[PDB]
Amino acid sequence: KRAALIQNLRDSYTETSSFAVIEEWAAGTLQEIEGIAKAAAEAHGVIRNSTYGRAQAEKSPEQLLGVLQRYQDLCHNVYCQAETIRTVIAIRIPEHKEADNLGVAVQHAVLKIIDELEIKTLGSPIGMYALREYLSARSTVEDKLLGGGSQSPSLLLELRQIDADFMLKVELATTHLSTMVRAVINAYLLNWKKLIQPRTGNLSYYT
Amino acid sequence: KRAALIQNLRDSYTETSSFAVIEEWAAGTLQEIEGIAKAAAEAHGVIRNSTYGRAQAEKSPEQLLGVLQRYQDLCHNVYCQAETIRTVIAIRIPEHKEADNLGVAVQHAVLKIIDELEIKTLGSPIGMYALREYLSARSTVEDKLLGGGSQSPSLLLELRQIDADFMLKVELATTHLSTMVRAVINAYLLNWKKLIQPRTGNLSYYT
Amino acid sequence: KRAALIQNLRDSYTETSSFAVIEEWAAGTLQEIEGIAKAAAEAHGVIRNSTYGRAQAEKSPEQLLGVLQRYQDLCHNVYCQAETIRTVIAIRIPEHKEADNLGVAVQHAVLKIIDELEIKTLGSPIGMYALREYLSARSTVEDKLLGGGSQSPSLLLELRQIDADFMLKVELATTHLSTMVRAVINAYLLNWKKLIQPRTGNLS
Amino acid sequence: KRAALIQNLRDSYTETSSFAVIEEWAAGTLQEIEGIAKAAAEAHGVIRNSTYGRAQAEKSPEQLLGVLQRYQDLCHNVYCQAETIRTVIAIRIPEHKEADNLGVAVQHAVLKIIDELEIKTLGSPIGMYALREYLSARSTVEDKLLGGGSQSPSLLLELRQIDADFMLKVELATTHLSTMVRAVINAYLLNWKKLIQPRTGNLSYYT
Amino acid sequence: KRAALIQNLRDSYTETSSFAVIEEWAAGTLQEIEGIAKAAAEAHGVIRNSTYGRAQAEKSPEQLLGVLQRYQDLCHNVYCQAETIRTVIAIRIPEHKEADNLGVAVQHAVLKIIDELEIKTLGSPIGMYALREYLSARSTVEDKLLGGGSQSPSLLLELRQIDADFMLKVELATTHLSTMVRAVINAYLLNWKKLIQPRTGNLSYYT
Amino acid sequence: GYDLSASTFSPDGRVFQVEYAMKAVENSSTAIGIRCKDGVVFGVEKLVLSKLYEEGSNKRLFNVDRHVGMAVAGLLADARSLADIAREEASNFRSNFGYNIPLKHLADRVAMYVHAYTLYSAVRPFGCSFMLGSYSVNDGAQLYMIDPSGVSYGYWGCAIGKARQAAKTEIEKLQMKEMTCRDIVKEVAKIIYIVHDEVKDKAFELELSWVGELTNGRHEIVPKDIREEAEKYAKESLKE
Amino acid sequence: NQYDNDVTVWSPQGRIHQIEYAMEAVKQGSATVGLKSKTHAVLVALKRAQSELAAHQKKILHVDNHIGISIAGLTADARLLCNFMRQECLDSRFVFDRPLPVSRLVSLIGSKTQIPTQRYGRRPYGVGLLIAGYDDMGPHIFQTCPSANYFDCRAMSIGARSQSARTYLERHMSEFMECNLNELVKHGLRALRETLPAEQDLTTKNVSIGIVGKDLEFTIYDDDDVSPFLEGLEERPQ
Amino acid sequence: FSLTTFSPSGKLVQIEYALAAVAGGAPSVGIKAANGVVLATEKKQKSILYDERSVHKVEPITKHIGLVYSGMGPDYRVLVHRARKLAQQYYLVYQEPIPTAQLVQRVASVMQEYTQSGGVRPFGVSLLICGWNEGRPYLFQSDPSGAYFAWKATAMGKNYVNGKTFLEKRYNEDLELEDAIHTAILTLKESFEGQMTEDNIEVGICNEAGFRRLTPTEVKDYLAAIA
Amino acid sequence: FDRHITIFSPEGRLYQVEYAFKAINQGGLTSVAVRGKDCAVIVTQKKVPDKLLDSSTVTHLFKITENIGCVMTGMTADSRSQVQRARYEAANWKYKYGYEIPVDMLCKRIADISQVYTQNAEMRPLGCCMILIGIDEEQGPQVYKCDPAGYYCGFKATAAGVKQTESTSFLEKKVKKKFDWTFEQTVETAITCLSTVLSIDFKPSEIEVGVVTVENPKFRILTEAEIDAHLVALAER
């Protein structure tokens, strides 16, 4: 049966599943965001307070890779958590109609905000695959400096700034993702009643 | 409860968090901006009044790296301070409706200027990561003038012009960022009442 | 207080601070534009009436560098004063409404002109950083000519024509920037009343 | 005072200054365009009746440089006096209003045509900087034909085809520029009453 | 004077100067378009039923350069003929108004078809400058096949495919061009009366 | 938009059509009126667009009754209409109550007819302000002005048109409460000559009217021997 | 731009553009001239034909034995207003047995045409009139406008190319007062001739004249009754 | 936007939006006992300055008919007047007091007059009409559409769904007029955002003796959970 | 859209009627009314910008009947129309029914008139508020206010204008203590409210005070020589 299939869908992804994501976001995700941000600052200070030589091209500090992998994990978790809410809203967009679409606009607005949170922030300043970017951009200069070796002094500082600006990028992207998550929380918690039941029939003036 | 989450969101970032940002921008950030501009205009004339040789390719001048780092540390805090106002406004956008959206339009217009501050004036002429592209541009000349070397005078003069242009760009970008900050201050101060409480009143004849 | 932050901004950037810009533009900047066009025409007529050899690749002509530095300084000053006018207009845009928006329209109209002058016309044909572009385009051909260099006959003429096309570019850009300055002057002088108090309309 | 500045501007760029340009365009510029269109086709027919070899790589044809320099001078002279008409119209755009803009529409409509003439049909198909566009390519081919040399004959015919194609480019660009000038002449002559005094204050229904 | 200029400009480009173009297009241009597609199909069938080796990379066919040159000579004449109609219509646009613009719409509608033809469909699938586009690619393949002589077989097959895909391209472009010319003929012949005199003012309801 | 009808409000409670109708009065020539101790005096800056118009065309001073005068600024057809309404009001008043209408009452009756045009979609507001002036032994001298909105207030001195500011700045200098009409004529002509600008518009005519003791409650055009004797004083006081 | 599609709408500058556009319909009609001496008032028009093989459109209309009009603009508005005038004059002769003054007729015309300027669902009258009459105050020449405004005039020309006639009349006003009828009609005809191209000239077919005075009712001279008034005109070169 | 226009689904949208103005007014309860009918509503003021003894949400139409509403009071004062006139027309013709159903019909006709023309909006009120005719109680519910419903108990206004489920779970017949007032006040106590005083509500009952608006003393009596 | 013509919105609201409450604040003035045990008082400010105006004509207090007085707040031309309609209704009431109209009834008649403008698209609503005062036979002094929407209610005290919330805070803070209300206490309360919310240190020229009492039920507008008597007593304590 057709309604049986629609029921099997709407029972697997319910309002409770979408609210379990909002609780976790408001509780732990934001503190993890702020932790990655303070860690990025803690790392950026070290590079700002350091001199680099040819020896620093022979090894990459694991302090930066740890923060980049933490941001990687955070981005992945938030992407899946947001696609859950998207799946909850999108299996309830009702029959297409010229009118009676005052709740459909709500669904499209919240889906647009979630699409923003995904694409405009996670990369799916800097996004999910910043670690690949860092390692490629550095592996260029590490070969240009070793061979034989290049006597360019500005290259040696450009290595240092590759190390620093990525921590800065993390520190800013986390600050922006916090705002986006805090906006999605309000949007859901204010509009959740017409995301589930968008249409409400009044047949009182019929006989 | 849901209202508990809303209220704990809004208690952490209130109006005073944003008025602190505006009052600090009106006092210290502007002064820092003109200071960086004067430093860059002072650095321009030095390189202008100097003939370059190959000795200037075997050494990067500290007096430009300092100005670029100062501009970077300014832009970082401007971004992180603007995101506070963004987070204060975006967690009060009320539930979606087809009307009573005057203060909603105020909110969106005051976000339409903070994004203008963040994107097309901050890099996140030139922006935050000037310090990496300055070095990656000058290295391309320093590796050619040293190798044997190269025997083009225009390349030496372009090294000189590279060192000069990035101070010119800092001066211009500071001149532009001052205008944008002064334009954000007015937009906040003339609209903060509709930014927090957009939808007001419930009149007695509706009962 | 909040209202003190308003007037401490609006008193430092008054209508006089922009009318001074307009007056100096009308007086001296137009003549400077004319002079740079004059010098670019001079150098362009000089390099057309010549014949380059491989000796030419071992020195950059200063007649071109001075002209490009002069245009660079002009464009820098114009950008600064344009941003002064922009600040004067932009610190006075009133609160946001759905009606009584006839002066805000004028504000955005003149800000469009200032943006058109800043972005599309100063590079901030060619704008502020013509000199380094010239130097790159010439360094490529110089290194390709000097090395057992290159036996190409057209490469030398390409160098010769770079050196002239850039003066042509400076001439055209001057001719174009004069027009935009003259347009901004008329816009300001005709709309400065609504650029200050666009919304004086109250009850009576 | 202010009106003195307005009048000092509008007295230096008058309807006479623009009618002179229109008359010169209708008199001599069109004949020069046609002459270039003749010479380009002559050179094209010449180069079609040729057989290129290694000898045609060590010598640039002056017959082509002449035509290209002639087209360059033409485009420059047309641009610089199109800017005259532009300034004439632009120092008379009246104050901003939401009504009585039936002459402002004519002003903008003619300035669009002037934009078409200026920014694309003169390169500010091919435009002003066609000679450098020709010599860069021909040098790129000569450097391989001469060396050790290249024995690919499609390269040798690509030389021929470059030399023929650019003459065809000029032959077509002249044909298009003639039309674009003949349109501006009519657009000016039919509208210079409203391009100059767009608004007319003569309202007899007041006291 | 001014009316003298307008009439001296309009009598030089008359409705007969466009009807002659339409006649020639309906008569001979379409048969030439057919003959080029015929020869391109012949050469395509020739190239398919043959196997390539090193000897093909040492000289180009006399069969394909002829077809491409003929297509080039076609497109040149079609462009130069379209611009005559363009001029005839463009020197008769009447003075700008906010009303009485139903013939101006016809003018701007046929000029859009002419714009779709000349600037775009002639490339001023493939355009007039296709012979150089063929020769550059075939030279790129030839210099790799001749050299160290690359022993890659897919390269030698790509040679044969370059020699056929361009004949295919000409065969398609000729069909498309015939379609567009047949469209322009109708568009002119059904609208030539308002393309010339778009406004008529026999105003009888005024005394 | 919110500015196309007088049946429409804006989100801040403004009706922009009524304001745009005042913008039309701001663009018209200047008329003034001054209340003296024993009468009222009207003066109008009457512009002559062409020399083909007779001397006496486009009269902007109207007699609405045998004790009431009217000066207008704005659209002139609208003013002639409102004069025709102010005449039938005073006519019906005498027909029903048997005596001359007061000016505080006539002003209210015309103000309401003007206000009625600020409420509907089928009509526009009036494009003219105007002053009324009367004198009676009991009611004394009186001067009211009525705006397009329908507001009506009393005055000691008033102006309407282009040079409103410039004219009231000169009228406040007058000690009108001490003076008579023949002395205020000089001042009325002097102000009209001060505020008139010969470069902004061409030559003009001076138009004056009176009501007071010296006319016995009869609104009259000023005689020529006095209008010239005041136009002369206006010229001789322009040495300043 | 967008305060134009209705007459009940003001613009932010305080203007009604439909009225200004109705005033532009007077410029589409042929030119008329009006002028007066101290004894007589004259209207001369220039008639216009649709097809060459048809009759010329009639430009001057009889309203009463002491009033007449010449029209430039829409024909229908003129035909309505003329029928208004005629009944307003008959209504005055019926009650008072006197001819209606001209000032009191043009005041009524203005009061009538003021309504379409203010109420929606009616079009402004796109016709201008020059009104020549004679009453107990002498001769009169009145201009009437689509703006519901009207002027008292020494002379005036309206219609297409009427600035030439106006410029002519403006420098001969000092003569019209003591002119006899022939000279006055000739001044009118010359002012009218100044509105034509240099190619064309005045003709019996395209000239109508209307005269009213003390001892003369409003008469109209159309085709062959005009040739006395044309004889005397200097054959102008250019 | 327009009222003389159907949607393709076949709905009248301005009527649906006029019901949204009823769904946001103050709550109102209605219970039909065996020997009476109760009408109760929330009469709460925005300040201590408003004099509550000057306006009434419970109004009589006749000796034996009474009203409450949810929504707009300006709209209510029109229908009160119309109902009071229609009752008198009926009396003038037949010299018998109007039955409670005929008044509902003739008042829904008035509400329907304002649903068919352009240039008029419908009423932003629903009504509850209590009566006592022919030895039986009655309770109806007129809507802006022109439609009426006879109820045994119902609630209108804010939280009109939970207030109705409360009645479904806490209402039966074999009651009397005093056990029903307690239930009506309990049904109003759900939505009362504060302490319920004698002056924050307004009560009216109908019975064999006729309609009467209770006094603040009688309200304070039963506000103690008494009877 | 749902804001130009008087239609309903999806949330059941009328925005053109809410925008007529905003026109009340365009005049830029504030009115206050207070009720006592034997009196009822209305107060407003009298702002002439020019010295050329006659101050006698610049008023917002009006006499509807001998026993009923009004203060109007909002657009000035709308108020004269509403006042003339109030006078016509008060006169026809007595012509028809043979006794003077109360305030309770005149107020709701004006409100019934105003509601038709919200339910019919013929005419615009009036951007004006109205506060009435009068002495009743059994009920005593009365203070009544009506709105552009047709809402009306009686009050112990109320205000109308820009400083209306910060006036009704003052008033609700003073009313709870329930002192022995009197004529002098009433007028002092009103003037103190208008002084606090405006902070202006009033003159007798800058306000106009209308009063009505059980002793003299005739509405009378006070003189500057009688407002000074109450103003001096304020500075003392």
Which residues fall within 8 angstroms of residue B3, CB to CB, at 6 or more apart? none
DSSP A5: H
Q: What are phi and psi of A198, to 5 degrees?
A: -75, -35
Q: Cβ(H18)–Cβ(H124) under 8 Å? A: yes
Chains touching G by CB (3 or more pairs below 8 Å): D, E, F
Range of the domain at H62: 1-227
Q: Does C178 touch chain D (CB under 8 A)?
A: yes
Within 8 A of I121 by CB-CB distance, chain F residues are: 7
Cα separation, I189 vs I171, whole angstroms: 8
Q: How far is B109 from chain I (nearest CA, A)?
A: 21
Record: contact D207-F28, CB cut-off 8 A: yes
CA angle, residues I226, I231, I234, in degrees to nearest 5: 145
Cα separation, E71 vs E68, whole angstroms: 5
What distances in angstroms separate CA B75 from CA B81, B173, B178, C87, one per listed residue? 10, 11, 12, 20
Record: contact B205-H74, CB cut-off 8 A: yes
Within 8 A of F19 by CB-CB distance, chain C residues are: 201
Q: Which of H1, H5, H9, H115 to mutate to test the interface with A (most CBs of A within 10 A)?
A: H9
Cα separation, G75 vs E204, whole angstroms: 9
Q: Does D1 touch chain C (CB under 8 A)?
A: no
Q: Nearest to residue C44, comparing CAs of C144, C185, C142, C160? A: C160
Cα separation, H214 vs I173, whole angstroms: 31
SS3 sequence of E46-104: HHHCCCCCHHHHHCCCHHHHHHHHHHHHHHHHHHHHHHHHHHHHHCCCCCCCCCCCHHH
Q: Cβ(H150)–Cβ(H163) under 8 Å? A: no
Within 8 A of E206 by CB-CB distance, chain G residues are: 25, 28-29, 73-75
CA angle, residues D50, E132, E180, in degrees to nearest 5: 110
Q: Cβ(H167)–Cβ(H180) under 8 Å? A: no
What distances in angstroms separate CA H118 from CA A18, F121, H121, I122, one per listed residue? 45, 15, 8, 11
Q: Cβ(C74)–Cβ(C32) under 8 Å? A: yes
Q: What are residue H133's DSSP bridge partners?
A: H136
Q: What are phi and psi of C54, to 5 degrees?
A: -60, -20
Cα separation, D180 vs F146, whole angstroms: 59
Pairing of strands F68-74, G32-36: unpaired
DSSP three-state, residue A123: coil
What distances in angstroms separate CA B181 from CA B29, B177, C95, E197, one per listed residue? 9, 6, 17, 57
* Radius of gyration from C-alpha coordinates of chain B: 24
Q: What are residue F132's DSSP bridge partners?
A: F70, F144
Q: Nearest to residue C130, comparing CAs of C55, C64, C82? A: C64
Record: contact C9-B161, CB cut-off 8 A: no
Cα separation, D62 vs C157, whole angstroms: 11
Which residues fall within 8 angstroms of residue C108, CB to CB, at 6 or more apart? none
Record: contact B135-A161, CB cut-off 8 A: yes
The sign of the torsion formed by the CA atoms of E151, E157, E160, E166 equals negative
CA G71 from centre of chain: 5
Both tokens of F11, joined, read 């989100």
Alpha-helical (H) ranges within chain H are 13-22, 73-94, 100-113, 162-169, 177-189, 216-222
Within 8 A of H8 by CB-CB distance, chain A residues are: 97-99
Length of chain H: 227
Q: Does C152 touch chain D (CB under 8 A)?
A: yes
Count CB atoms within 10 A of the CB of residue G197.
8
Tell me whether residue C99 is exposed, middle or buried, using C-beta atoms within 10 angstroms of its C-beta: 0 to 12, 13 to 18, 19 or more.
middle
Provide long-range contacts, Cβ within 8 A and 24+ apart, for E93-100.
E93/D183, E93/D186, E93/D187, E94/D190, E94/E198, E94/E199, E95/D106, E95/D190, E95/D191, E96/D105, E96/D106, E96/D109, E96/D191, E96/D194, E98/D102, E98/D105, E100/E199
Chain H residue with the nearest C-alpha to that of A97 = H9
CA C136 from centre of chain: 22
Q: What are phi and psi of B65, to 5 degrees?
A: -60, -40
Q: Which of F76, F78, F201, F202 to mutate to test the interface with D (most CBs of D within 10 A)?
A: F76
What distances in angstroms separate CA I135 from CA I65, I212, I213, I218, one per listed residue? 12, 7, 7, 9
Q: Nearest to residue E56, comparing CAs of B19, I187, D152, I85? A: D152
CA angle, residues D113, D117, D120, in degrees to nearest 5: 115
Length of chain D: 207
Both tokens of D73, joined, read 């001078």
Q: Cβ(I24)–Cβ(I17) under 8 Å? A: no
Record: contact H20-I10, CB cut-off 8 A: yes
CA angle, residues C156, C160, C165, in degrees to nearest 5: 140
Q: Cβ(I12)–Cβ(H24) under 8 Å? A: yes
The sign of the torsion formed by the CA atoms of E37, E43, E47, E53 equals negative
Cα separation, C162 vs G130, whole angstroms: 73
Q: Does C203 touch chain I (CB under 8 A)?
A: yes
Cα separation, I71 vs I83, whole angstroms: 10
Q: Cβ(H205)–Cβ(H218) under 8 Å? A: no
Count CB atoms within 10 A of the CB of residue F104.
16
DSSP three-state, residue H150: strand
Q: What are residue H129's DSSP bridge partners?
A: H67, H140
Tally of structural domains, chain H: 1
Q: Which residues of I touch B (CB under 8 A)?
A: 1-3, 9-13, 15, 17-18, 21, 147, 149-151, 153
User: E strand or H helix at I130, and its extent?
Assistant: strand I128-135
The full DSSP string for H2-27 is -SS---TT---HHHHHHHHHHTTS--
The full DSSP string for I188-219 is HHHHHHHHHHH-----SSSEEEEEEESS--S-
Record: contact G11-F27, CB cut-off 8 A: no
Record: contact B9-A185, CB cut-off 8 A: yes
Cα separation, A111 vs A93, whole angstroms: 11
Cα separation, G54 vs D126, whole angstroms: 59
Q: Which of I5, I7, I11 to mutate to test the interface with B (most CBs of B within 10 A)?
A: I11
DSSP three-state, residue H30: strand
Count CB atoms within 10 A of the CB of residue D140.
14
Chain B residue with the nearest C-alpha to that of A169 = B124
Cα separation, F135 vs F215, whole angstroms: 10
Record: contact I52-F172, CB cut-off 8 A: yes
Cα separation, H142 vs H115, whole angstroms: 14
SS3 sequence of chain G: CCCCCCCCCCCCCCCCHHHHHHHHHHHHCCCEEEEECCCEEEEEECCCCCCCCCCCCCCEEEEECCEEEEEEEEHHHHHHHHHHHHHHHHHHHHHHCCCCCCHHHHHHHHHHHCHHHHECCCCCCCEEEEEEEEECCEEEEEEECCCCCEEEECEEEECCCHHHHHHHHHCCHHHHCCCCHHHHHHHHHHHHHCCCCCCCCCCCCCCEEEEEECCEEEEEECCCCCHHHHCCCCCCCC
Tally of structural domains, chain G: 1
Both tokens of F10, joined, read 């804006």
Cα separation, C147 vs C155, whole angstroms: 13
Resolution, Å (one decimal): 3.0
Pairing of strands F31-35, F157-160: antiparallel
E strands along C34-173, which residues? none
Q: Cβ(H125)–Cβ(H76) under 8 Å? A: yes
Q: Nearest to residue D111, comparing CAs of D138, D142, D90? A: D90
E strands along chain E, which residues? none
E strands along chain C, which residues? none
**Angle between helix C153-191 and C62-90 (nearest 10):** 30
Count CB atoms within 10 A of the CB of residue B96.
19
Both tokens of H126, joined, read 């629903």
Alpha-helical (H) ranges within chain F are 16-26, 76-97, 103-115, 164-171, 181-195, 224-236
Q: Chain I neighbours among C 163-202 (CB < 8 Å)?
A: 202
Record: contact D96-C191, CB cut-off 8 A: yes
DSSP three-state, residue B17: helix
Within 8 A of C203 by CB-CB distance, chain I residues are: 26-28, 75
Record: contact B157-C65, CB cut-off 8 A: yes
Q: Does B165 touch chain C (CB under 8 A)?
A: yes
Which residues fall within 8 angstroms of residue B157, CB to CB, at 6 or more apart? B52, C60, C65, C135
With touching defined as 3 or more inter-chain CB pairs under 8 Å, the answer for chains G and E is: yes
Provide long-range contacts, Cβ within 8 A and 24+ apart, for G202-207.
G202/G46, G202/G230, G202/G233, G204/G230, G205/G47, G205/G49, G205/G56, G206/G46, G206/G47, G206/G48, G206/G49, G206/G56, G207/G44, G207/G45, G207/G46, G207/G47
The sign of the torsion formed by the CA atoms of F222, F27, F203, G39 equals negative
User: E strand or H helix at C127, and its extent?
Assistant: none
Chains touching B by CB (3 or more pairs below 8 Å): A, C, H, I
Q: Nearest to residue F55, comparing CAs of F47, F65, F63, F67? A: F47
Provide long-range contacts, Cβ within 8 A and 24+ apart, for A35-39.
A36/A67, A36/A70, A36/A71, A36/A74, A36/A170, A36/A174, A37/A170, A37/A171, A37/A174, A37/A175, A39/A66, A39/A67, A39/A70
State which amino acid sits at residue D193: K
Cα separation, C138 vs C57, whole angstroms: 8
Cα separation, I171 vs C125, whole angstroms: 70
Count CB atoms within 10 A of the CB of residue A95.
7
Q: What are residue H150's DSSP bridge partners?
A: H140
Cα separation, I150 vs I116, whole angstroms: 9
Q: What are residue H137's DSSP bridge partners?
A: H132
Cα separation, A191 vs H152, whole angstroms: 35
Length of chain E: 207
Q: Does E107 touch chain D (CB under 8 A)?
A: no
Record: contact I84-F8, CB cut-off 8 A: no
Chain G residue with the nearest C-alpha to that of F4 = G9
What distances in angstroms separate CA H226 from CA H179, H193, H220, one per listed residue? 10, 21, 9
Count CB atoms within 10 A of the CB of residue H101.
15
Q: Nearest to residue E87, comparing CAs of D191, D182, D184, D29? A: D182
State which amino acid sits at residue H174: D
Record: contact G15-D203, CB cut-off 8 A: yes
Record: contact C99-F19, CB cut-off 8 A: no
State which amino acid sits at residue B45: G
Q: Cβ(G143)–Cβ(G156) under 8 Å? A: yes
Q: Nearest to residue E130, comparing CAs of E59, E40, E67, E46? A: E67
Of the candidates C102, C155, C175, the beta carbon closest to that of D139 is on: C155
Q: Does D3 touch chain F (CB under 8 A)?
A: no
With touching defined as 3 or more inter-chain CB pairs under 8 Å, the answer for chains E and F is: no
End-to-end CA distance of chain H: 49
Q: How far is I147 from chain F (nearest CA, A)?
A: 14
DSSP H142: E
The number of helix segments (H) and strand segments (E) in chain H equals 6, 11
DSSP A203: -
Torsion of CA H133, H134, H140, H145, to 10 degrees: -90
Chain C residue with the nearest C-alpha to that of B108 = C96
Both tokens of C130, joined, read 């013509």
Q: What are residue F135's DSSP bridge partners?
A: F141
Q: Burial code of B3-26, b = ≥16 C-beta within 10 A, e = fewer?
A: eebbeebeeebeeeebbebbeebb
Cα separation, H221 vs H103, whole angstroms: 33
State which amino acid sits at residue A158: E
Q: Cβ(A116)–Cβ(A72) under 8 Å? A: no
Of the candidates B91, B131, B143, the beta carbon closest to that of A161 is on: B131
Record: contact A205-H13, CB cut-off 8 A: no
Chains touching E by CB (3 or more pairs below 8 Å): D, G
- Identify the residue whose tokens are 């429409």: F8
Record: contact I52-F7, CB cut-off 8 A: no
Cα separation, C175 vs C169, whole angstroms: 10
Cα separation, E177 vs E183, whole angstroms: 10
Q: What are phi and psi of I157, to 5 degrees?
A: -150, 160
State which amino acid sits at residue H211: F
Q: Does D187 touch chain E (CB under 8 A)?
A: yes
Q: Nearest to residue D85, comparing CAs of D191, D152, D13? A: D13
Order the strands of the F128-136 sheet from edge to edge: F61-65, F68-74, F128-136, F140-146, F152-154
Cα separation, A114 vs A186, whole angstroms: 12
